[PDB]
Symmetry: C2
Subunit: 168 residues, 2 copies
Amino acid sequence: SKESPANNPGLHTPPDEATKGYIMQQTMFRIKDPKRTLEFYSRVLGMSLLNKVDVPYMKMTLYMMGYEDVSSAPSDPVEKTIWTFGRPATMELTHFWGTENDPEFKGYHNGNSEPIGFGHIGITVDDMYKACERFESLGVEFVTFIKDPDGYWIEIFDLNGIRAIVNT
Amino acid sequence: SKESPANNPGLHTPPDEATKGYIMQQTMFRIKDPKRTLEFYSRVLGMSLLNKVDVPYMKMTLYMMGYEDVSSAPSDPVEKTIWTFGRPATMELTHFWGTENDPEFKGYHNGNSEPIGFGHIGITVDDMYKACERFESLGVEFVKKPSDGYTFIKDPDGYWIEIFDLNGIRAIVNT
Ligand code: NI
Ligand code: NI
């Protein structure tokens, strides 16, 4: 296959046994205002607030977001946090206190203009027509990419659209 | 709880029906050199190569990587791509042809120096101290000391990758 080590210099297979059980747990973005951020990730994207971790000594709050049923999460706060950090595919949205009130705060950089680096996260939806119609109805900002309230890029795709691209 | 909508202005919960089954599928980084990036994510982190997509009209290759048994994936290349895009928690590592040789390539920006923005990805390991001894053995660069229950290592482009175990998290939270 085109994914084989012979076709991909540097690819190491099989994974070392010491790594088995590692999970890709989070992607962290710095965010200006938790009110706008919470509304975007929870209302527009459908994620749940898995955990809010205030870190007073660092003047910051971590909002852990993801696609989970929090009605069945552990009720004990410590065990709910441990549960959160066992879940793959979360967002860590970091609010440094005061950015939302500082008239000199210049904004966070999204990686897609110089200096370039970070690209985007991407969400698999059921149907790109339905998803985009609904985003328009909610007043979402479009760059297929939408933008969160700090300007980070969020790619949207469905499996039928992927199949059509791969087939050309 | 401290995650309640009453305690968190802007929180819209539970999710809208239309978002049923949405998944957080990928985190995309631009990478200078696919051989270095494949070795880091596959050897150091233990990710697999789920899919390689050459896009010749954009002079780029997409390397999709994550924690999966790729021996379980479809053999049909089209179906294997579709399988990839139904897996949560992947990396999309984007190689623009020529950055690996260009003598004036300035590097990719990791978000943690001005102008700041993007932070990191993070990996839950079995045992931070065990993981870090092994990272050391593989010549991995560290951003901070393994202490206070977390560290960051750097990928070949300089992106930060947090490392923690659940005992580390529990210790942090209990303070
Ligand atoms: Ni993408
Ligand atoms: Ni983190």
